[PDB]
Write a protein that binds this ligand. Sequence first.
Ligand SMILES: N[C@@H](Cc1nnc[nH]1)C(=O)O
Ligand SMILES: N[C@@H](Cc1nnc[nH]1)C(=O)O
Ligand SMILES: N[C@@H](Cc1nnc[nH]1)C(=O)O
Ligand SMILES: N[C@@H](Cc1nnc[nH]1)C(=O)O
Ligand SMILES: N[C@@H](Cc1nnc[nH]1)C(=O)O
Ligand SMILES: N[C@@H](Cc1nnc[nH]1)C(=O)O
Ligand SMILES: [Cl-]
Ligand SMILES: [Cl-]
Ligand SMILES: [Mn+2]
Ligand SMILES: [Mn+2]
Ligand SMILES: [Mn+2]
Ligand SMILES: [Mn+2]
Ligand SMILES: [Mn+2]
Ligand SMILES: [Mn+2]
Ligand SMILES: [Mn+2]
Ligand SMILES: [Mn+2]
Ligand SMILES: [Mn+2]
Ligand SMILES: [Mn+2]
Ligand SMILES: [Mn+2]
Ligand SMILES: [Mn+2]
Lengths: 191, 191, 191, 191, 191, 191
Amino acid sequence: SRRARIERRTRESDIVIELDLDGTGQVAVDTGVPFYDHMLTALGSHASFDLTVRATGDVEIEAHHTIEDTAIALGTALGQALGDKRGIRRFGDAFIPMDETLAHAAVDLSGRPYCVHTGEPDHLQHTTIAGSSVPYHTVINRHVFESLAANARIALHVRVLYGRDPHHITEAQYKAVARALRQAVEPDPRV
Amino acid sequence: SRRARIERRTRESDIVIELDLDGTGQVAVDTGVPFYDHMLTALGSHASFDLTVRATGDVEIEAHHTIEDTAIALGTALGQALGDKRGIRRFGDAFIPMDETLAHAAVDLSGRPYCVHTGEPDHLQHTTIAGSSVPYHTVINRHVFESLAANARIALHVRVLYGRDPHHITEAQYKAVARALRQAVEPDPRV
Amino acid sequence: SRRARIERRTRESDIVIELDLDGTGQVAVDTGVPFYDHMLTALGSHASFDLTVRATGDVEIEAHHTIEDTAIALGTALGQALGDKRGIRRFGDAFIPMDETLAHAAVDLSGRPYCVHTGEPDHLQHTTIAGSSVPYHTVINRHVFESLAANARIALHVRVLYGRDPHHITEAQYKAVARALRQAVEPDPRV
Amino acid sequence: SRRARIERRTRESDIVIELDLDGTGQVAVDTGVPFYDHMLTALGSHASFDLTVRATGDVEIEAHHTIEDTAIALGTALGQALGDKRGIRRFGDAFIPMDETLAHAAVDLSGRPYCVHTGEPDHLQHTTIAGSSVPYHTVINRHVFESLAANARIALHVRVLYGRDPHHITEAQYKAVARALRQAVEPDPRV
Amino acid sequence: SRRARIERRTRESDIVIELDLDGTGQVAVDTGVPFYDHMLTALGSHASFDLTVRATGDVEIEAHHTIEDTAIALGTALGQALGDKRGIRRFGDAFIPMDETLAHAAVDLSGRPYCVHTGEPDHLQHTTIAGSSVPYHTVINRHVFESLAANARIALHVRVLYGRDPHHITEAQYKAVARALRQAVEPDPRV
Amino acid sequence: SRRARIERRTRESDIVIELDLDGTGQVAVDTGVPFYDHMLTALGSHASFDLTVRATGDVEIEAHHTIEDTAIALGTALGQALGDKRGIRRFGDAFIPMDETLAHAAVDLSGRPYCVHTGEPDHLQHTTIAGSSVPYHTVINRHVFESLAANARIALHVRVLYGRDPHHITEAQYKAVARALRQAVEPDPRV
Ligand SMILES: N[C@@H](Cc1nnc[nH]1)C(=O)O
Ligand SMILES: N[C@@H](Cc1nnc[nH]1)C(=O)O
Ligand SMILES: N[C@@H](Cc1nnc[nH]1)C(=O)O
Ligand SMILES: N[C@@H](Cc1nnc[nH]1)C(=O)O
Ligand SMILES: N[C@@H](Cc1nnc[nH]1)C(=O)O
Ligand SMILES: N[C@@H](Cc1nnc[nH]1)C(=O)O
Ligand SMILES: [Cl-]
Ligand SMILES: [Cl-]
Ligand SMILES: [Mn+2]
Ligand SMILES: [Mn+2]
Ligand SMILES: [Mn+2]
Ligand SMILES: [Mn+2]
Ligand SMILES: [Mn+2]
Ligand SMILES: [Mn+2]
Ligand SMILES: [Mn+2]
Ligand SMILES: [Mn+2]
Ligand SMILES: [Mn+2]
Ligand SMILES: [Mn+2]
Ligand SMILES: [Mn+2]
Ligand SMILES: [Mn+2]
């Protein structure tokens, strides 16, 4: 049984995460930031987690505090659900083509936080993905992955090999992180 | 049962493909272009497909029309054999060292055609691999992969990380595409 | 049963290797070069081999002859334990993040020796990792992998994508080679 | 008596080599690739070997598999004929001018395979030498020398100092390798 | 009879050399610097000298004084054993491949000291080869060859054509100097 | 018996050459150009030829016509003395250190004239070596070697690897050509 429920309340946001590592992709995400909900839904589904996230935060300022606090809490939930990590594969990686984009992630569930994020085109440091609700600044992608690795206490390396569309580039990275985790958390039949 | 038989007749060529995704490498290829037969035999075997290809075409002009038409028909056969794609891994990738060459392919069985082919040394845009029969112009490698992805309706990304011999460089790419497909078409035990 | 015992005596060193490909990481290494013992222990464990190495050699000169002779003998033991290679996956690869470092290895158990080692920062050609016993010159990493591939008769491609600490850079490569071998030697359920 | 007979049958080719190191240049070569026959005849004659090679292979694809398999088998025959290498010169080198070309080879019969091939003009990576039979792609020169060194288990270093004509450049290298071997295999009157 | 015994005592070191040019490789070297003993043992053996060297010196400072004084004394012993040089080949050269390294030396026994040492990679000016005893700084290679040429009163040209491992690069040069001397000191059957 | 006597009379010069390939260095040269006499005396001695050259020519103009005509006649004498070339080594090369200079020559007694002369420092295209008699312009070195190769009908490749003094640079090349010829003309005990 590899489950964790994390509640995180700050002046800026209120988060509840329920996570099961051995899920089948039963995912419900609601953070008030719909493009981030979309990315975390991709992450939960492609990782084959069961995952509920409910977050409310100060989106009148912008999405950053809610996005970061949610990734902190999700990271904590992952590190708590992994427990002593006995018997698992520990290493995982995945390539994700998404039309013109190719992204990759590799993970070591080592207990030492580390994140290296490389290759994202420079226009992503000032791109906004905007719809009819609160927008998502793609500069935050790096912060999401760093907050995840820091609080799960894992090494997470995320690379964009190439790509052009900012939604494809973002979504392929969240998917790659998701499939890398899925491989690394699985029981290893030889250990 | 994941099988397709495709017949494609044009003014330029006559093709029959019989494909089974759940094969054991039972492969017979005859296109009149023996180096291409060799590459498609590698592709069928390393993908663990059962695959028969019989093609006749206008090789007095050169191999291009037969090669492209065969890849179009093979692509169509793959997309037809995959059917609704329920329950499969969907993503697959593979590295293939071949002496000095290292190639890689990643696939997303997404239903949207896309191909990105990168890294092949520039001398491959005018190299000929010639024996005692119809020769094979390595410039056509890109067209084969694009025609495969376009007609199977999948994302296919093929990279040459490095290499020198044009037969190794070509053959390592066909093998990589083959092993990437093999992983992506397999049933996924968690979906 | 995929086991080999190799004894190799030269003027410079005396080596005994006992290797089992189908092990569970039962590893004991003693070469007189403690950082190399550490790397070969990583290699045996991450490959899920059972592996005993006992080497004594001319470390008053420096570690090179003992290190190389041991890798030659270990390579021979691998190629002997693999036997006719019937029914195995044959290809294997692995990414290994280790804090700031990311390394990768890909293997083809082809029967033709080949090694390509790329990306290691230039300071590793004159770095020493020194403790209270015989030191380890990281310039030797390349020679270890080449001697392994040459005597097992396999293609081994080892890459450092990036990194800074010489112990992380070294150890991530030995781990990557180890996990790539583990994948490639495994029985392939479809062949 | 320093003789070896090697038979090598693969799906791609059937090879028989009979080699005598202490010959007088009695050489008969028939591989189905007449420019390669010419180069191996040069090699056998300039090395003062007696050498018979008979190879048949899949030249409808192109010459590569027959060429490589023959060099593998010839390498094995050399390493077998050298036996324990007692009493020989061990090191050998030779310069070969051939009109505008100057090539060189150096050998160490060390028991550790190694090949370094440098200086060949870049146009040789896509040059074809074509007559009325199966052609020879000069990109294969490097692969021939590497396969020879790998299977004889010797260090072979081949350099083109300069040159322009691809037949002179190729033939001067095979001659240089041949004369370097001839010197290195000879009995050394002081050991 | 071409023999010399040289004793050289300084405040820093005490050296005894016994040299025979017409030897069979009977070599015993003990200087307190085991990697240097290894190189001088290579030099004596590959030159087909009989050579005893016994040196003790101030290795608490470092190896330099013992290494240089020994090469001075060995040079003097060579120049004394050559005597009037009547009837010898006088010129000698040798290429030495050592895995990835290729080194070369040429000699003229002219009676005028000269040394030109070129091609050694720049990292060798600050590389240490260290084991469990006194280490060897590869910056000293040049000084060894210069001291040898200066005291034997010969022209000695040592080149590294290419290479990477500092032990291979060093050892291939000492071997090349050794085989070049062996050729040059031999009786010339036509003079 | 490998001897030739050549007389060559032109409006510009009168030459007599007597050459024996199987000599012991009995050399007498008198051309009216004393530095050229010195170089041809080096050439005859280091080649172990017996060689008499007596030339008189229009040195009031400068040395060029006498120097070139003598090299033409000497070349003709070499090609005539070699006869059918049966049973000889055919290939020869030699390195010649001369203080700071290192030169090299390689020869193929092929019956096709060819000369490639490379590496000589650019100041040699306008250097004069002057004493109390007729001077020698070092620009002529290339013409001497080309005239030798053209009239003996051999491939001659002469290289200066490095050097500074024009007399050392010149003399080391003539010596290298001489020792390369000496090796190439010798009977080959295996053919
Ligand atoms: N919410 C955290 C971190 C943060 N605040 N603004 C942007 N990032 C804090 O208040 O320090
Ligand atoms: N066969 C197709 C595509 C094609 N024709 N020549 C090269 N490529 C056509 O006729 O358009
Ligand atoms: N031990 C082997 C290889 C080697 N020696 N020094 C460094 N590498 C030999 O003696 O040739
Ligand atoms: N014949 C060998 C090597 C090779 N195949 N194509 C080019 N080189 C094999 O099948 O792996
Ligand atoms: N031993 C000699 C030369 C030397 N001293 N330190 C480094 N080299 C001397 O005392 O001058
Ligand atoms: N002596 C020959 C060649 C020559 N003349 N001046 C420089 N070189 C002739 O008259 O052509
Ligand atoms: Cl990659
Ligand atoms: Cl050279
Ligand atoms: Mn923040
Ligand atoms: Mn989307
Ligand atoms: Mn087309
Ligand atoms: Mn092939
Ligand atoms: Mn070594
Ligand atoms: Mn460690
Ligand atoms: Mn090949
Ligand atoms: Mn020819
Ligand atoms: Mn000093
Ligand atoms: Mn050594
Ligand atoms: Mn002229
Ligand atoms: Mn002089």
